[PDB]
Coordinates of all heavy atoms in Angstrom, one line a residue:
Chain A
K5 N -0.4 10.7 -1.1 CA 0.3 12.0 -1.3 C 0.4 12.9 -0.1 O -0.5 12.8 0.7 CB -0.3 12.8 -2.5 CG -0.4 12.1 -3.8 CD -0.9 13.1 -4.8 CE -1.7 12.5 -5.8 NZ -2.4 13.5 -6.6
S7 N 0.5 16.8 0.7 CA 0.3 18.2 0.2 C 1.4 19.1 0.7 O 2.2 18.7 1.5 CB -1.1 18.7 0.7 OG -1.2 18.7 2.1
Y9 N 0.9 21.6 2.4 CA 0.5 21.9 3.8 C 0.9 20.8 4.8 O 1.4 21.0 5.9 CB -1.0 22.1 4.0 CG -1.4 22.6 5.3 CD1 -0.9 23.8 5.9 CD2 -2.2 21.7 6.1 CE1 -1.3 24.2 7.2 CE2 -2.5 22.1 7.4 CZ -2.1 23.3 8.0 OH -2.3 23.7 9.2
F31 N -2.5 18.6 19.9 CA -3.2 18.4 18.6 C -3.9 19.7 18.1 O -3.7 20.1 17.0 CB -4.3 17.4 18.7 CG -3.9 16.0 18.2 CD1 -4.9 15.0 18.4 CD2 -2.7 15.8 17.7 CE1 -4.6 13.7 17.9 CE2 -2.4 14.5 17.2 CZ -3.4 13.5 17.3
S32 N -4.8 20.2 18.9 CA -5.6 21.3 18.5 C -4.9 22.6 18.4 O -5.1 23.4 17.4 CB -6.8 21.5 19.4 OG -7.7 22.5 19.0
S35 N -2.1 22.6 15.5 CA -2.8 22.7 14.2 C -3.2 24.1 14.0 O -2.9 24.7 12.9 CB -4.1 21.8 14.2 OG -4.9 22.1 13.0
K36 N -3.9 24.7 14.9 CA -4.4 26.1 14.8 C -3.2 27.0 14.5 O -3.1 27.6 13.4 CB -4.9 26.6 16.0 CG -6.4 26.2 16.2 CD -7.0 26.6 17.6 CE -8.2 25.8 17.9 NZ -9.0 25.8 16.6
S39 N -1.6 26.6 11.0 CA -2.5 27.2 9.9 C -2.6 28.7 10.1 O -3.0 29.3 9.1 CB -3.8 26.5 9.9 OG -4.7 26.9 10.9
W42 N 0.5 29.6 8.2 CA 0.4 29.3 6.7 C -0.3 30.4 6.0 O -0.1 30.6 4.8 CB -0.4 28.0 6.6 CG -0.5 27.5 5.2 CD1 -1.6 27.2 4.5 CD2 0.6 27.1 4.4 NE1 -1.3 26.7 3.3 CE2 0.1 26.5 3.2 CE3 2.0 27.1 4.6 CZ2 0.9 26.1 2.3 CZ3 2.8 26.6 3.6 CH2 2.3 26.0 2.4
Chain B
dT6 P -8.8 3.1 14.4 OP1 -10.0 2.2 14.5 OP2 -8.4 3.6 13.1 O5' -9.0 4.2 15.4 C5' -9.4 4.0 16.8 C4' -9.2 5.1 17.7 O4' -7.9 5.2 18.2 C3' -9.5 6.5 17.0 O3' -10.8 6.9 17.5 C2' -8.5 7.4 17.4 C1' -7.5 6.6 18.4 N1 -6.1 6.7 17.8 C2 -5.1 7.0 18.7 O2 -5.2 7.1 19.9 N3 -3.9 7.2 18.1 C4 -3.6 7.2 16.7 O4 -2.4 7.4 16.3 C5 -4.7 6.8 15.9 C7 -4.6 6.7 14.4 C6 -5.9 6.6 16.5
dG7 P -11.6 8.0 16.6 OP1 -13.0 7.7 16.7 OP2 -10.9 8.3 15.4 O5' -11.3 9.3 17.6 C5' -11.8 9.3 18.9 C4' -11.2 10.4 19.7 O4' -9.8 10.1 19.7 C3' -11.4 11.7 19.0 O3' -12.4 12.6 19.6 C2' -10.0 12.3 19.2 C1' -9.1 11.2 19.5 N9 -8.2 11.0 18.3 C8 -8.6 11.0 17.0 N7 -7.5 10.9 16.2 C5 -6.5 10.7 17.0 C6 -5.1 10.6 16.8 O6 -4.5 10.5 15.6 N1 -4.3 10.5 17.9 C2 -4.8 10.6 19.2 N2 -3.9 10.5 20.2 N3 -6.1 10.7 19.5 C4 -6.9 10.8 18.3
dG8 P -13.3 13.3 18.6 OP1 -14.4 13.8 19.4 OP2 -13.6 12.4 17.4 O5' -12.5 14.5 18.0 C5' -11.9 15.4 18.9 C4' -11.1 16.4 18.2 O4' -9.8 15.8 17.8 C3' -11.7 17.0 16.9 O3' -11.5 18.4 16.9 C2' -11.0 16.3 15.8 C1' -9.6 16.2 16.4 N9 -8.6 15.2 15.9 C8 -8.9 13.9 15.5 N7 -7.8 13.3 15.0 C5 -6.9 14.3 15.0 C6 -5.5 14.3 14.4 O6 -5.0 13.4 13.8 N1 -4.8 15.5 14.6 C2 -5.4 16.5 15.3 N2 -4.5 17.6 15.4 N3 -6.7 16.7 15.7 C4 -7.3 15.5 15.5
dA9 P -12.4 19.4 16.1 OP1 -13.3 20.0 17.2 OP2 -13.0 18.8 14.9 O5' -11.4 20.6 15.7 C5' -10.5 21.2 16.6 C4' -9.4 22.0 15.9 O4' -8.4 21.0 15.4 C3' -9.9 22.7 14.7 O3' -9.1 24.0 14.5 C2' -9.6 21.8 13.5 C1' -8.4 21.0 14.0 N9 -8.3 19.7 13.5 C8 -9.3 18.7 13.5 N7 -8.8 17.6 12.9 C5 -7.5 17.8 12.5 C6 -6.5 17.0 11.9 N6 -6.7 15.8 11.5 N1 -5.4 17.6 11.8 C2 -5.1 18.8 12.2 N3 -6.0 19.7 12.8 C4 -7.2 19.1 12.9
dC10 P -9.6 25.0 13.5 OP1 -9.1 26.3 14.1 OP2 -11.0 24.9 13.0 O5' -8.7 24.7 12.2 C5' -7.3 24.6 12.3 C4' -6.7 24.1 11.0 O4' -6.7 22.7 11.0 C3' -7.5 24.6 9.8 O3' -6.6 25.2 8.9 C2' -8.0 23.3 9.1 C1' -7.1 22.3 9.6 N1 -7.5 20.9 9.6 C2 -6.7 19.8 9.3 O2 -5.5 20.1 9.0 N3 -7.2 18.6 9.2 C4 -8.5 18.4 9.4 N4 -8.9 17.1 9.4 C5 -9.3 19.4 9.9 C6 -8.8 20.6 10.0
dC11 P -7.1 26.0 7.7 OP1 -6.6 27.4 8.0 OP2 -8.5 25.8 7.4 O5' -6.3 25.5 6.4 C5' -5.0 24.9 6.6 C4' -4.7 23.9 5.6 O4' -5.2 22.6 5.9 C3' -5.3 24.2 4.2 O3' -4.3 24.2 3.2 C2' -6.2 23.1 3.9 C1' -5.8 22.0 4.8 N1 -6.9 21.1 5.3 C2 -6.8 19.8 4.9 O2 -5.8 19.3 4.3 N3 -7.8 19.0 5.4 C4 -8.8 19.5 6.1 N4 -9.8 18.6 6.4 C5 -8.9 20.8 6.4 C6 -7.9 21.6 6.0
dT12 P -4.6 24.8 1.7 OP1 -3.5 25.6 1.4 OP2 -6.1 25.3 1.7 O5' -4.7 23.4 0.9 C5' -3.4 22.8 0.6 C4' -3.7 21.5 -0.1 O4' -4.6 20.7 0.7 C3' -4.3 21.5 -1.5 O3' -4.0 20.3 -2.1 C2' -5.8 21.4 -1.2 C1' -5.6 20.2 -0.2 N1 -6.9 20.0 0.6 C2 -7.3 18.7 0.8 O2 -6.8 17.7 0.3 N3 -8.5 18.6 1.5 C4 -9.1 19.7 2.1 O4 -10.1 19.5 2.8 C5 -8.6 21.0 1.9 C7 -9.2 22.3 2.4 C6 -7.5 21.1 1.1
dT13 P -3.5 20.3 -3.6 OP1 -2.0 20.3 -3.5 OP2 -4.3 21.2 -4.5 O5' -4.0 18.8 -4.0 C5' -3.9 17.8 -3.1 C4' -4.8 16.7 -3.4 O4' -6.0 16.7 -2.6 C3' -5.3 16.5 -4.8 O3' -5.3 15.1 -5.1 C2' -6.7 17.0 -4.8 C1' -7.2 16.6 -3.4 N1 -8.2 17.4 -2.7 C2 -9.2 16.7 -2.0 O2 -9.2 15.4 -2.0 N3 -10.0 17.4 -1.3 C4 -10.2 18.8 -1.3 O4 -11.0 19.4 -0.6 C5 -9.1 19.5 -2.1 C7 -9.2 21.0 -2.2 C6 -8.3 18.7 -2.8
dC14 P -5.8 14.5 -6.5 OP1 -5.1 13.3 -6.7 OP2 -5.7 15.7 -7.5 O5' -7.3 14.2 -6.2 C5' -7.6 13.1 -5.3 C4' -9.1 12.8 -5.3 O4' -9.8 13.9 -4.6 C3' -9.6 12.8 -6.7 O3' -10.5 11.7 -6.9 C2' -10.5 14.1 -6.8 C1' -10.9 14.3 -5.4 N1 -11.2 15.7 -5.1 C2 -12.2 16.0 -4.1 O2 -12.8 15.1 -3.6 N3 -12.5 17.3 -3.8 C4 -11.7 18.2 -4.4 N4 -12.0 19.5 -4.2 C5 -10.8 18.0 -5.4 C6 -10.5 16.6 -5.7

Side-chain angles (χ1 to χ4, degrees):
Chain A
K5 304 183 210 171
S7 58
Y9 186 67
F31 260 180
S32 190
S35 171
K36 283 173 197 313
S39 75
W42 186 237

